[PDB]
Structures are given as C-alpha cells and as structure tokens.
C-alpha cells in the first residue's frame, strides 16, 4: 500500500544516494514532506551510526562477503533475526537502514550497483511486512521523524 511505497521510496533514495553521492533531483510521491524529512533524518542519524560503528560494520561486511543479489537473501534472514527477541524500536530500524547504506556503498565499489534495488526491497520488507503492526502503531515515517527530531 501507501506505507509500502513510501518506505521503499525513502529507503531506496537513501541507499542510492549513499552509494553514489548523488542526490536524486526528481520529486517525491504522495506525502512528500514526511519523506523529505525522513531522508534528512537518515542522512543525519545514519551518519552517526555508521561512524560510531564503522569498524564493526566493516567486519560484518567481510563476514557476509556480499557480492551477489543472493548474499542479500542471507542478509534478509539476519535482518529478520534482529527482531526475533521481540524488541522493536526506532534505533534498531535506523541501524538496519544505516547498515544497508554501508552495504550499498560496498556494492557500488565492486560494480554491482543495480543490486541496491533488491537490497532496498529487502530492508523495506522487514519494516512493512515483518514489523508492519509496530510501524503503523508508531505512526510510520512521521513517528520516525519525530523520534529523531533535533530539539531547538
């Protein structure tokens, strides 16, 4: 539905921009203001995650040795497994997307840039299928933006 489209748009845009360093110039779809704020939030908060945990993220990438649209399936099982302790929070969600960006960058450097598309799809599926009820209860991307808002 709309939550799926909005999520895939936000996550795809973030991962592609992280991999290429190019901001997409085209307009967002419905609920564009929330999506633009979600992207601002991912840029800002995802930077803190990736820099605080860069060494660990590097080691994770080495472990997985992702080089094919199929190692991404292994990553999907890992990402679902994150939530198997029954704990959900916005920190875990931003962290998964941040690790996704770290992987997207690696995929570009090894010349598999089109795999950023199935990568974005797999991360989106964890939020909008696996954790749909929590996402909706927490107000979706508006809740995400509010959780990470910068105080005056």
């Amino acid at each position: 539905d709309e939550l799926y489209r909005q999520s895939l748009e936000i996550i795809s845009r973030y991962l592609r921009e992280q991999a290429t360093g190019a901001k997409d110039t085209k307009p967002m779809g419905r609920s564009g203001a929330t999506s633009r704020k979600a992207l601002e939030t991912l840029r800002r908060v995802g930077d803190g995650v990736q820099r605080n945990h860069e060494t660990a993220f590097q080691g994770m990438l080495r472990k997985l040795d992702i080089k094919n649209e199929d190692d991404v399936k292994s990553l999907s099982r890992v990402m679902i497994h994150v939530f198997s302790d029954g704990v959900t929070n916005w920190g875990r969600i931003v962290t998964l997307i941040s690790f996704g960006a770290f992987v997207a960058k690696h995929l570009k450097t090894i010349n598999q840039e089109s795999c950023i598309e199935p990568l974005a799809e797999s991360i989106t599926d964890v939020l909008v299928r696996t954790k749909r009820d929590w996402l909706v209860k927490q107000r979706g991307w508006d809740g995400f933006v509010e959780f990470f808002h910068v105080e005056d």
């Binding site: 803190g48 995650v49 945990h53 990402m79 302790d85 704990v87 920190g91 969600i93």
Partner: peptide, 13 residues
Amino acid sequence: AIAEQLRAIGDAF
C-alpha cells in the same frame, strides 16, 4: 554474530 551486533547498536540509538 551479526544480528546481536545490529541489535546492540539499535538499542543504544
């Protein structure tokens, strides 16, 4: 263990 590391970082965040 990747999932444990991702969980930890998400709970701190």
